[PDB]
Amino acid sequence: RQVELSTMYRHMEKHNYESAAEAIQAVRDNKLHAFIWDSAVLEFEASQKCDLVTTGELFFRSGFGIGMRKDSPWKQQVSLSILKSHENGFMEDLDKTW
Amino acid sequence: ICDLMSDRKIQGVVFADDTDQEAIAQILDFISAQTLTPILGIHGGSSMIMADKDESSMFFQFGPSIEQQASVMLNIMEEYDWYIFSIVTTYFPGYQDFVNKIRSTIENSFVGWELEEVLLLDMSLDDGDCKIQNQLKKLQSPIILLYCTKEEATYIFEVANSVGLTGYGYTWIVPSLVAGDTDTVPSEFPTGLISVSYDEWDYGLPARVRDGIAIITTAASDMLSEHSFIPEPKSSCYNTHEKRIYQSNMLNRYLINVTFEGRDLSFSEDGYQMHPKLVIILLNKERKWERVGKWKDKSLQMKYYVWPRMCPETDDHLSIVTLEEAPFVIVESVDPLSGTCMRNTVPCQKRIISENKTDEEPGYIKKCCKGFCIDILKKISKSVKFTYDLYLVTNGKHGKKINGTWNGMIGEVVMKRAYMAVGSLTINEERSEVVDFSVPFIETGISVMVSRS
Amino acid sequence: RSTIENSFVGWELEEVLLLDMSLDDGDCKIQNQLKKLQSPIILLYCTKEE
Amino acid sequence: VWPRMCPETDDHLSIVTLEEAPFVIVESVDPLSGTCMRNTVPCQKR
Amino acid sequence: EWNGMMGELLSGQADMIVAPLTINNERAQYIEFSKPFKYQGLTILVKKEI
Amino acid sequence: GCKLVTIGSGKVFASTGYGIAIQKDSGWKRQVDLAILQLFGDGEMEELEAL
Amino acid sequence: KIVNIGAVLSTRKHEQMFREAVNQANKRIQLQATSVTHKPNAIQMALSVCEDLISSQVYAILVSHTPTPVSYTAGFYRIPVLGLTTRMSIYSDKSIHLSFLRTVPPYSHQSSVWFEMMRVYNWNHIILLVSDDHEGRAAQKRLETLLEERESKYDNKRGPKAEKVLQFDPGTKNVTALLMEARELEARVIILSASEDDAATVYRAAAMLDMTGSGYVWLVGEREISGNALRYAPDGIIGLQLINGKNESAHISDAVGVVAQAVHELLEKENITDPPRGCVGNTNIWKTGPLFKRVLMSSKYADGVTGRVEFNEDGDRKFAQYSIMNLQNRKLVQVGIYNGTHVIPNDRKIIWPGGETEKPRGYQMSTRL
Numbered sequence A: 001r002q003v004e005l006s007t008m009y010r011h012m013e014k015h016n017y018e019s020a021a022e023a024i025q026a027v028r029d030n031k032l033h034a035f036i037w038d039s040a041v042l043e044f045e046a047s048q049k050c051d052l053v054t055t056g057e058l059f060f061r062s063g064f065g066i067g068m069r070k071d072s073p074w075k076q077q078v079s080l081s082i083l084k085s086h087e088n089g090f091m092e093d094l095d096k097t098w
Numbered sequence B: 001i002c003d004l005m006s007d008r009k010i011q012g013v014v015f016a017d018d019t020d021q022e023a024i025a026q027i028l029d030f031i032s033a034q035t036l037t038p039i040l041g042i043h044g045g046s047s048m049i050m051a052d053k054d055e056s057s058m059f060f061q062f063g064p065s066i067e068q069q070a071s072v073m074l075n076i077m078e079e080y081d082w083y084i085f086s087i088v089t090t091y092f093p094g095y096q097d098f099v100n101k102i103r104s105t106i107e108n109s110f111v112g113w114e115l116e117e118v119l120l121l122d123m124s125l126d127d128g129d130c131k132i133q134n135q136l137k138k139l140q141s142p143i144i145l146l147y148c149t150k151e152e153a154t155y156i157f158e159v160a161n162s163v164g165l166t167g168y169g170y171t172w173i174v175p176s177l178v179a180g181d182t183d184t185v186p187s188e189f190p191t192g193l194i195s196v197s198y199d200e201w202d203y204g205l206p207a208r209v210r211d212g213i214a215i216i217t218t219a220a221s222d223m224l225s226e227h228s229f230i231p232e233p234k235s236s237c238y239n240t241h242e243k244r245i246y247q248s249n250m251l252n253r254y255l256i257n258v259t260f261e262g263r264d265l266s267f268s269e270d271g272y273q274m275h276p277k278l279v280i281i282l283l284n285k286e287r288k289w290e291r292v293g294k295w296k297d298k299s300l301q302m303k304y305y306v307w308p309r310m311c312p313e314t315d316d317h318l319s320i321v322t323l324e325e326a327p328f329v330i331v332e333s334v335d336p337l338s339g340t341c342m343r344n345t346v347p348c349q350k351r352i353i354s355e356n357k358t359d360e361e362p363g364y365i366k367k368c369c370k371g372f373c374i375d376i377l378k379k380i381s382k383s384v385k386f387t388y389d390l391y392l393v394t395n396g397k398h399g400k401k402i403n404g405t406w407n408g409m410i411g412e413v414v415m416k417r418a419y420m421a422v423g424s425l426t427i428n429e430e431r432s433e434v435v436d437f438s439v440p441f442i443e444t445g446i447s448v449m450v451s452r453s
Numbered sequence C: 001r002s003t004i005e006n007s008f009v010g011w012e013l014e015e016v017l018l019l020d021m022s023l024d025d026g027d028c029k030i031q032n033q034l035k036k037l038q039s040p041i042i043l044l045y046c047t048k049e050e
Numbered sequence D: 001v002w003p004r005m006c007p008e009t010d011d012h013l014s015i016v017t018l019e020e021a022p023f024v025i026v027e028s029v030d031p032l033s034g035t036c037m038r039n040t041v042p043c044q045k046r
Numbered sequence E: 001e002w003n004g005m006m007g008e009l010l011s012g013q014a015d016m017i018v019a020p021l022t023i024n025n026e027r028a029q030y031i032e033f034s035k036p037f038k039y040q041g042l043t044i045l046v047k048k049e050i
Numbered sequence F: 001g002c003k004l005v006t007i008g009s010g011k012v013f014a015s016t017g018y019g020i021a022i023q024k025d026s027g028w029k030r031q032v033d034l035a036i037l038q039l040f041g042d043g044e045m046e047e048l049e050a051l
Numbered sequence G: 001k002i003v004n005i006g007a008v009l010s011t012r013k014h015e016q017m018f019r020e021a022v023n024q025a026n027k028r029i030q031l032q033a034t035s036v037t038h039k040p041n042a043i044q045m046a047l048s049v050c051e052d053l054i055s056s057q058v059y060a061i062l063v064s065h066t067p068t069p070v071s072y073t074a075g076f077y078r079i080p081v082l083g084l085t086t087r088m089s090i091y092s093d094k095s096i097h098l099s100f101l102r103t104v105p106p107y108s109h110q111s112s113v114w115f116e117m118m119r120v121y122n123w124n125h126i127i128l129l130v131s132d133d134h135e136g137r138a139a140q141k142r143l144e145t146l147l148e149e150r151e152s153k154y155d156n157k158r159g160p161k162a163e164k165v166l167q168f169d170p171g172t173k174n175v176t177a178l179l180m181e182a183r184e185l186e187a188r189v190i191i192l193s194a195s196e197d198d199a200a201t202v203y204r205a206a207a208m209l210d211m212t213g214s215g216y217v218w219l220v221g222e223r224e225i226s227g228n229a230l231r232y233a234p235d236g237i238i239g240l241q242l243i244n245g246k247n248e249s250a251h252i253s254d255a256v257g258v259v260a261q262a263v264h265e266l267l268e269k270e271n272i273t274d275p276p277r278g279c280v281g282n283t284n285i286w287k288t289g290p291l292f293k294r295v296l297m298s299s300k301y302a303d304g305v306t307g308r309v310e311f312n313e314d315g316d317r318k319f320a321q322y323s324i325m326n327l328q329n330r331k332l333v334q335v336g337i338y339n340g341t342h343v344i345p346n347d348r349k350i351i352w353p354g355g356e357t358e359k360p361r362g363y364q365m366s367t368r369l
């Protein structure tokens, strides 16, 4: 749902792939010009293999949180805990891990 | 009137009644230009305006000036910063110059005025078509203006009242002559209806009699000063036919400016007084008027700082406070030529106390609010469509836990002193458990900076 | 609608309104919401009588 | 083309041009529909 | 209807989705959210210049 | 690749421009005139070249 | 079943003819009539309206000659009333006067046909000369109203448009300044709407300013030729005659006809009352008056004495016909007529102020820029 890409979305059904890894392979074989995904993952990817480069800008501010259904008390506990990590370098430690 | 001239000799006339039917004053005014006779209605509907009098009439009334009537309406809008409004009239006189004054006032300023619509009712026909009812059903504002006779206003209030424009999120403001009388309330009037009038209590009826008497007095003194004669009044409306070319009336030019007793009564050439006394009127919960404000010396002093409002059963308004913080908040002084903040910028209040040893807590001075997070509140507002407020915050930049309490905005929520708040919120576990959170709309975190030499 | 949104096509649907043929008309409510119709062409689903 | 009268208002007009880069797109309609997509507009071929 | 991890969730085939979950408007109209545990965004990728 | 360009800065012979001509001897001229005038009114032309 | 309706006219002759006409309508529920004179002043008029008129439980009245006080009365009673002779603009809008209708259009609507007369002559240029008042503002108003145009579909040139406008004070001694202004104007085609003394002034002024010569045009209606204005009136000036306007009787009749139409079709409706008898003590307007008015609006009479009769948004005679005039050797002759779409030139050859049968074109473009 947007007006602008409507051309694009109209154009993008064709060559889309099942698993982004496959895309990495494909452009990695030059069978693709470019691929659309969320940044951090790809920073990791090209960060691994010299062959590829992040895009110029960064857009569609976004983030990751634990999937849980509807309403169950677990939400508060979980997120509270995740702050309970970000409070300290646990996350940065997670970089150090991966 | 004629017999009043035949019995005694009246160089002048004073008229008043308590009634609501202004046409009295209409044909009276007509007689003014008929007989070349100064006549002062001092009170009642006899004061109400009839648009575009004769160029030959001498007549006058005490009532707000149509242009500056709606202008007072404008400043009224300037009080609580009510931007979204409309205006509704019949074919009754004045609409043209009315609207002209409206928009002409609108577009000429840095102010952020936004006018949605204006529609024209028909009170001539009766209703099988609901056309009135329908185009009223086209009205989107929380408050709108209506210009018409009290009689017409009855039928309107009825039909629109069926349409559901009378609830919370709804209010109405009408000019003085609209509701007219103090003490006569058609029930179908909307609750908490708004208008403004010449002061009911502060302005005496006999006092007014003295007012006009003095007017004609010093006036005749002004012709007698210069000319030392006054045209002999024609005592018979019958015989008035031959005196047309005889009488040479210069009186008007002196009639206009009258300086007496320190309170200027002077009118203007269009049939209105320069600085008449004006008082804002608001309807109570008991359906009985009370003087809720006054407009004096081309200026306003309100009886309340913030608008009294009930909201029996829907709490659809909320409370918000934060500190202006670069960038995210703009706070500026309002423009002197208006008094509110301009453009898309939004209002806020200032709780600054004066002396440490006193309480004395109205504690508010309006000041500009705008900027980014402000606009976040804007988008969300126009999305879920609910009201919002903002004001300055007294204690600390953000907030902290001193001992058992919280000194700051978030804390200002947890004690229910305010419902919501904004600004730059570090979203932590610490402050978490006492409050609730959204998805964050900004990514940020601890960082340091120095200079590259 | 199910047909509408599922395609690359550029369909744009303005409005849909529901008439009342049960009542009779003092209210012009039919008449009015018909007065809300902006299309150059529109569809109507009902009995010939209605 | 659709038969239409327009007795008394000529409020429709006639236009023709060549597709020219960039300024005009001309493409084949999608088989799964048969008209052109999105905001793209129709035209005829003589 | 739905399919995917969302699907097994709504159907109830599992409690927990652990994943680089895109945070949209729609899913929250169904699934609950936490604070974000990472900040990512859109990008594009292509072969480096020879 | 990026290779060709016009000579110079874009100095152009025959200063002219695109527009829309119509059936001659109409009144619709002034109307459409004021139209695309308004088109620079919103400055939407910015969006236009942008696309 | 009684029907009471009034009139006020100049002479009892039209009283007798008036009632007789009412009887001519009897063949067309029972009628009753009332009539009295015109007052010199305003007050006693309304006085006799209550005492003599309103006391009779009157549905309508007829007026001739500001007659406006009558309407003031009718309006405080909201009672529709139709007279004859007033071309004054006060009755243009409903503004002061809610219920009123007319047998003929105002002085203003002359321009309505003027424009089309230009279309007979295919003129792209004008000179608008009017003093400013209620009347004048009306004139320019409707004038420019037609001059808002070119919504279509003609006009092989760029189309007609207002060249320039000039205001001046009524009763002015000398306006010649704006006239010399009109000298540099791009056209020779002048248009005028002015009062009696006004027209005289402007004509003499033209004489001194010698714009009376070849190629000049002067567009006026009938209001100009009448009165002493004709004496000073310039040679061969274009003019008009509102058809029959000076005729009191037949107009009174056709009015009564429209009235009757309202009687038959209206009174077949329901929820009906009667207006008050005495003026004193009665503050309530007659609930149905506006409806009666709207019936008068929808009223269309196929056969009148003057023929078909029509009304505008303000309920004023529309698609009425005119006599078109011109001056020949200090004598006015009828050069044509108008219906709704066009002018019919008669057999006579239209005479211009200058030489013979040449119809000049005032678009002459000064090489001075």
Ligand SMILES: *[C@@H]1O[C@H](CO)[C@@H](O[C@@H]2O[C@H](CO)[C@@H](O)[C@H](O)[C@H]2NC(C)=O)[C@H](O)[C@H]1NC(C)=O
Residues within 6 Å of the ligand: G173, G174, G175, G176, G208
């Ligand atoms: C009208 O007649 C003559 C026409 O010229 C007037 O004379 C002009 O008057 C205006 C205004 O007073 C002056 O600005 C001009 O300079 C005058 N020009 C000439 C040639 O006299 C005359 O003033 C007018 N009549 C009266 C009685 O004032």
Ligand SMILES: *[C@@H]1O[C@H](CO)[C@@H](O[C@@H]2O[C@H](CO)[C@@H](O)[C@H](O)[C@H]2NC(C)=O)[C@H](O)[C@H]1NC(C)=O
Residues within 6 Å of the ligand: G319, G338, G339, G340, G341, G342, G344
């Ligand atoms: C006034 O006279 C003109 C002159 O004929 C009439 O104009 C004709 O009008 C009819 C229909 O109204 C058309 O079919 C003709 O083509 C017109 N011919 C011309 C030469 O104009 C006009 O109709 C007459 N007025 C009225 C009210 O009928």
Ligand SMILES: *[C@@H]1O[C@H](CO)[C@@H](O)[C@H](O)[C@H]1NC(C)=O
Residues within 6 Å of the ligand: B253, B256, B257, B258, B259
């Ligand atoms: C006000 O009154 C003074 C008293 O002489 C007079 O000179 C002046 O003209 C008056 N003001 C106006 C606007 O006429």
Ligand SMILES: *[C@@H]1O[C@H](CO)[C@@H](O)[C@H](O)[C@H]1NC(C)=O
Residues within 6 Å of the ligand: G247, G248, G249, G250, G251, G305
């Ligand atoms: C009014 O018109 C009639 C009919 O045309 C005609 O007799 C005359 O012009 C006028 N009436 C009288 C009595 O003169």
Ligand SMILES: *[C@@H]1O[C@H](CO)[C@@H](O)[C@H](O)[C@H]1NC(C)=O
Residues within 6 Å of the ligand: G270, G271
């Ligand atoms: C007044 O007239 C109307 C219109 O015919 C009709 O409903 C009835 O006669 C009266 N109204 C009511 C509500 O009875």
